[PDB]
Ligand binder design. Structure first.
Ligand SMILES: Nc1ccn([C@H]2C[C@H](O)[C@@H](COP(=O)(O)OP(=O)(O)OP(=O)(O)O)O2)c(=O)n1
Ligand SMILES: Nc1ccn([C@H]2C[C@H](O)[C@@H](COP(=O)(O)OP(=O)(O)OP(=O)(O)O)O2)c(=O)n1
Ligand SMILES: Nc1ccn([C@H]2C[C@H](O)[C@@H](COP(=O)(O)OP(=O)(O)OP(=O)(O)O)O2)c(=O)n1
Ligand SMILES: [Mg+2]
Ligand SMILES: [Mg+2]
Ligand SMILES: [Mg+2]
Ligand SMILES: [Mg+2]
Lengths: 481, 481, 493, 493
């Protein structure tokens, strides 16, 4: 039997029994113990929500979109099989997230295991495979009209993109291309994943969402673009699409890259790094794994959630003392201190290979200020944050197809010039934040002098509080006045 | 006694008895019969709200802001007298609006009376004067600690700006400069008027508001800028301020300049123009006025509201037949037809003196298309819409002062470069919309050919549906491909 | 231009409209056709809550947008039932007919909605028995005939004669005189329960106004209609196919009627809103001889007679208030003066409220006599003023769960998880002991038309004395407003 | 750096925090100091609604954010009263003390909130009498002492010994044994009514959870606390200064308790949520001998004994669920296995619900005997299975208006517009006949631990037979789940 579930965002949702079967497994239920916004909860007290409820919402919206397209255009031949496969991909897209979500694959794994290249999406494919195999899902799929081998493949492609390096997909053909655009849209980033998190994150954060996904659904059609049937938006809705990406950027700005939230994520990561040699997680065949190696074994990874934070915090093992001590500083709210923020000026980009060298640069600045303290490279954190419209330097709207009232089956393109002169001139930028691990008044004052001097030396933008935090430094640069 | 009133936007609000006294007059109650968004209601069925409830909200928020500043900074010496005067200005700012709000001073009066230069704000001063004088308000003001002559002057200045063409204000001195920034902020447009309408219009329209005025209040301080005490925002809130103006622009884009809403406003205006010789409104000393002359007599103007639409619609006078007939076409939904939209390309600006000449230009275009119909100048409407951040070409954030965490009493400035490269490169633009009054299939097809040809001739932007609506025209211009 | 299975694909793009309550709604072209008429557009000029706007400044909404929402929800419910139970053979014809009934249910409302058929017409024309629902049938008939709707109906698969009849029945109930309906048979009985549910009052009309009124009033709605839809099925009850709720949702259904009663209490029977409605009605009564409204064939009608001619009635909206307010005719001076007192907020003064005590009911035939009773009371208090019958207004308000003395849940059928096609009944005792023991009551409000402090003080003494004489309940503020009166009644102490 | 009247201006910028319910809240530095401790931060790891999250996927919220909201609202109410009535001489010291009590009221909650002191401790330690409120006092004492709070209190004008006492009294009620309080006198009685109102249950704790729980659950709140604040005054009642509501707000107060009862009904006593709480408790019981928690001086405690040591208790949160779930110790296998059944959604099965009929009350001393009664029933039905006492769970749920059998509105004082300083009482009969006639009741839920279809079918027969034998109410689905049983009882027909 279908179940009805009440979600605060979407209201009363129906879950097909096959979905219920997938949901009621250790692999899916695991997402109840992983916070959507990671350390954000320690800044936004409403942000208590977990990946579980987001995944349900994504599964639901994926079904909503596919159904709506099918009802409007029978000629697409969307089957209930297709609907289920998209719902399942929606449900399972986040299965590979680790403790504190983006903290894990964004901060911890790069530091704990530089030799690997890991993403939560790859994790999701592996965990999905593990969910299917450990819980006897294949016969249940068959029972509801799915073809497991083809459809499992299709689901994985929806999650992670083409699985092999020309129509690059095997699970569905070009005439159902639009099905790959629903859960995770690699072409332009317009997908139901965003739609759920905009609404859900806003509801919990206490920030109001200004994007209307239901309007989008109503104005969506499928049209022939090249040899594919693709989702197209109504032409006059282009402004709303630009606003959609604007909203994503505002949420990143206000909430997801919050300067304190990020420093909490940083501190948690430092603690995990201190604990990683001492915490054991039992995986397949009794083998032991670490926090950093649990990603190599889905049975161990199943048991790796936000609970690791509390295992550390409540530990008595002397070997965990350093890790424990960092988490206690989180609790006492003795956090690393924000120094400032700046950006590059020209066409200038900071390369990732250079990130590690930045704290030394800041330490090596020579502010012409008499200081009671001298600071070292290790005292500074330099966070380089890429802010963009989801496709690096590119305008996603250049990869959207539209239709017009007078010819609803004909796909067209719209350029930036055809829309508005008040839109962004660029679609990517970098923010550079600097923090100091020395928290006393005198270290902080010194840190600000080094930071502003560094901005001056590098021809970066003048920090907003520059004249206040470093009055002796800002005059030297008259690009700044 | 104070009254408590329940407003869906702000909840339970307290009204001081002096405010109640002002509210319970014919001059204020009049605002119950004027729609906030004018013709917008005929496109957005939730937009039934009137100026009355908006004015209450503006009065309330003005008090909220002033109170908050005063509680935080006693050194400002904000009195309850000051609070009342700002509330009253907030309440009374909209008293000068006419039938269908912006339709009246935006479309009707310019056409009905080209020789005058009229604004609703000027109207508000005159109506406020009339409210005070007709209802014995001055003694009531005295009773509550106001000084009528000075304070009435102060209120009018808050509404319309400096009354004489150096500190240009008389009602309050430089040390209370911040009081002029509350209701109608002529310096940068950050005021409580916007805050109420964002929230209220969104609530009724079915579009969600993404600006948080309460956060703004919490981060607001008053600091010395030159010799004035001015409102300053916290430095890191600059992004949110840019978003505030972004929200205003989105609302104008989606709702207030809706292409059909505007055409309904246009049609209502045409009807008023047809009726203007025949409708009589009795003013002071029994004198008769017209719709177009009621602005010269506050007693007549008091009786000029949205009711004029229904007076016309329900009239039987043969002399009102033409006017009545236009309104009936609104009811039957036989509206003028949208042809398209375009913009200028270069540094190019369309001057207001040239607006009237544009329909002739469109009619004089020579599309190389065989047409079954020929159209004249009078068949086209050309609407030129200025979209901007409230200060023409200027960036309002260049006229905002900020403070920093480390020095909260020190005002500073922040440039666009110091914020983000993803922000608008320009702050003003023009939209050009064209409509046709001939509604049959063949006229509309012809109208599109003339329109796109005109865009090509003028080097305007390619209409979004250009290739669809005029496939024979778009190839000639290879700036377009 | 495109083909599938060898046949040209036709793209029929529906109109989309954005409603703040229901979001983006699609309107079938037949609905659009009905909507874009003078008869329907008229509802833009009639406030949903009448005088309520003069108390709740958010309540600016008109009947127009409510009607759209009811039309939309009616379609939603019918669709959902049909999707879950194909065996019902709900057709798109049935869906359209229910949507149209939903849209058109309110066509007969007059100026300020319930003020008109609730207060004005009973006073202006005692000999007639008029209801807005009857008005809606007449206006619907007029809308159809004046706008050439019948061919358009045919074009979309409707059978005009049968279906027009069916729509009218949905609006007003059985039109005659055993299955009492002609538009649809017993196997589609559930279709009559969607727009206006005469059996138990569970319908989409309530669902829209709960959500819409709450949105505008600034009171939060606590009923969830979407949950209800999800738990609704059609089951055989007697020889009819009727809508049934899931058994465990019974608590929520009780709560639904609780919500309706709270909204009536807080908002629709607000003591000041009602007095504004009363004053507007008085003004209309003073204007009724002098205002002319042109109807069919140039005939003149009055405010009170416009209900006899749909062409005149089409032009009778909230505008009549402003026509009066802005008039210069000396003969309208009395009417005008009343409306000006509204603007200056010189309203009749609330005196108090009481209720009957026993199984005691105040009969409607006795309402008119109540102000004299109050005036004839003899309070043992030294007063500066003596008040007459004409100085008092006595408003008797029936508050109930929509079916007089009856529990609506006794007329609801339910189904159980284990046997979803079997209808059952649930009694009050099977649910909760914390529920109401009665389902109807009367509130008696008294007001005074003399507004000075002395008259008001006197009015309170007469009022509380009257409550004592009649063995009514002690007013909540009795000891404060009339300390010398309340001791005489020891049932009160 | 700046001066006014010749004295340097000091700028003390408060911390601002954004809460989705209350928006942007300012936190006094003393509050911040209390918040940023292990004892307070602990509340981040305890779900407000316990097992409710496993039914309502939005209910992910923890006690931490609720506590912040209660602290905030307590300050709001006290401030508002003081602004309107300076004569009360509410000081900023009083305000801080009430805020702190608000913040700290929930410090004593254990894993899954009401599951812990409601289900687990009674079962794990029958000899003790434990409440979360007592826990809160102990944890508050521990928070103060471990974090050097007393000097910080002094720094902001508090008198630690008196004020700490006062805070504890606000949390748990009178600490001893006539004015029963020591922290504040009778003229500040109203201060004890803010956080936890022992007299009638109208407090800010409810106001926060109504709004917060509704936000997360996906059920809309219909109570308006801000309206209440606007209509609240302090008046002399006996020799105390007490909070009084405006008279005409009585209906809204009844509605407030109606809302609380609906939330309990829909969400907090959800039949599946409760069974999840039951299963989690069973798992804790099987784990209790094997889990060690280190407390003061290295001493070891168990889940059931951690309440005896605040240092251990600090480390007892919802984490214990995952410790069990992820354990490999063979001795934890039984506990682990129960939690895995939760994950696989192999829950105990709901059988049905009934209530007592007369003035009949089931006594708590008899609860334990009920499963045997059910098992001893003799249904005249042919069954494949026989069930034992241990196969049944019988949950007896007390539903009431917060004061057992009593009407809380009988313990509320009101004021009237004309005499705002005079307290009065309003009886139920003075309000409405549509209100509850009783204010407390018992719901009896039965579940079966045997989950196969045959056992479930059998369980329903035993259950309905038991209801018949005990003259309980007929289950709502009785005729469907047990058609052969319901005819024997003609009180049911
Ligand atoms: N009055 C109620 C009852 C439940 N819920 C929520 C909790 C769940 O997210 C969803 C489904 O709850 P049900 O109680 O309807 O589901 P069950 O599975 O308990 O009922 P059954 O199995 O008997 O259908 O609705 C709700 O919002 N309001
Ligand atoms: N339960 C209620 C009652 C009223 N209102 C609204 C309508 C008004 O906008 C505001 C004030 O209503 P009151 O009924 O409190 O005001 P009155 O002026 O009628 O009461 P009184 O003069 O007796 O104080 O609150 C409300 O939201 N909820
Ligand atoms: N950005 C927008 C634009 C419009 N609307 C609302 C107003 C109407 O209630 C509904 C439909 O508006 P459209 O602008 O889509 O409809 P038109 O009829 O103007 O467009 P067209 O005829 O070109 O499809 O949506 C909205 O909510 N948001
Ligand atoms: Mg269930
Ligand atoms: Mg009043
Ligand atoms: Mg259109
Ligand atoms: Mg900070």
């Amino acid at each position: 039997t279908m179940k009805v579930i009440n979600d605060p965002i979407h209201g009363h949702i129906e879950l097909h029994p096959l979905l219920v079967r997938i949901i009621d497994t250790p692999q899916f239920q695991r997402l109840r113990y992983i916070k959507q916004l990671g350390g954000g909860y320690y800044v936004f007290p409403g942000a208590s929500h977990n990946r579980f409820e987001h995944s349900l919402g994504v599964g639901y919206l994926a079904g909503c979109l596919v159904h709506a397209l099918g009802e409007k255009q029978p000629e697409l031949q969307i089957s209930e099989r297709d609907v289920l496969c998209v719902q399942i991909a929606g449900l399972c897209h986040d299965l590979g997230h680790g403790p504190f979500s983006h903290m894990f694959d964004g901060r911890f794994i790069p530091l704990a295991r530089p030799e690997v290249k890991w993403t939560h999406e790859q994790g999701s494919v592996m965990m999905f495979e593990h969910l299917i195999n450990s819980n006897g899902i294949k016969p249940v799929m068959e029972q509801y009209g799915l073809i497991p081998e083809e459809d499992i493949y299709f689901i994985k492609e929806q999650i992670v993109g083409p699985l092999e390096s020309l129509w690059p997909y095997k699970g569905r053909p070009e005439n159902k291309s639009f099905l790959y655009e629903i859960v995770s849209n690699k072409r332009n980033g317009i997908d139901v994943d965003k739609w759920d998190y905009f609404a859900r994150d806003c509801h919990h954060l206490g920030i109001q969402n200004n994007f209307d996904y239901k309007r989008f659904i109503k104005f969506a059609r499928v049209c022939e673009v090249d040899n594919e049937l693709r989702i197209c938006a109504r032409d006059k809705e282009v402004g709303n699409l630009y606003d959609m990406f604007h909203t994503r950027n505002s949420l990143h700005r206000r909430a997801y890259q919050h300067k304190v939230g990020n420093i909490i994520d940083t501190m948690i990561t430092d603690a995990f790094l201190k604990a990683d040699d001492y915490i054991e997680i039992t995986g397949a065949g009794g083998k032991k794994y670490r926090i950093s190696t649990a990603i190599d074994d889905m049975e161990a990874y199943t048991k790796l959630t936000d609970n690791i934070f509390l295992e550390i915090l409540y530990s008595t093992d002397p070997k965990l003392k350093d890790a424990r001590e960092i988490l206690k500083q989180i609790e006492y709210r003795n956090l690393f201190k924000y120094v400032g923020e700046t950006q590059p000026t020209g066409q200038i980009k900071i390369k990732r290979e250079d990130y590690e060298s930045l704290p030394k640069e800041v330490a090596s600045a020579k502010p012409k200020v008499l200081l009671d303290v001298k600071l070292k490279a290790e005292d500074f954190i330099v966070d380089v944050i890429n802010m963009d419209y989801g496709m690096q330097e590119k305008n996603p709207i250049d990869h959207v197809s539209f239709y017009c009232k007078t010819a609803p089956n004909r796909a067209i393109r719209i350029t930036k010039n055809q829309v508005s002169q008040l839109l962004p001139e660029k679609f990517a930028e970098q923010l550079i934040r600097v923090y100091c691990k020395k928290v006393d008044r005198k270290s902080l004052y010194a840190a600000r002098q080094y930071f502003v001097q560094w901005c001056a030396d590098r021809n970066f933008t003048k920090p907003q509080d520059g004249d206040v935090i470093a009055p002796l430094i800002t005059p030297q640069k008259k690009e700044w006045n």
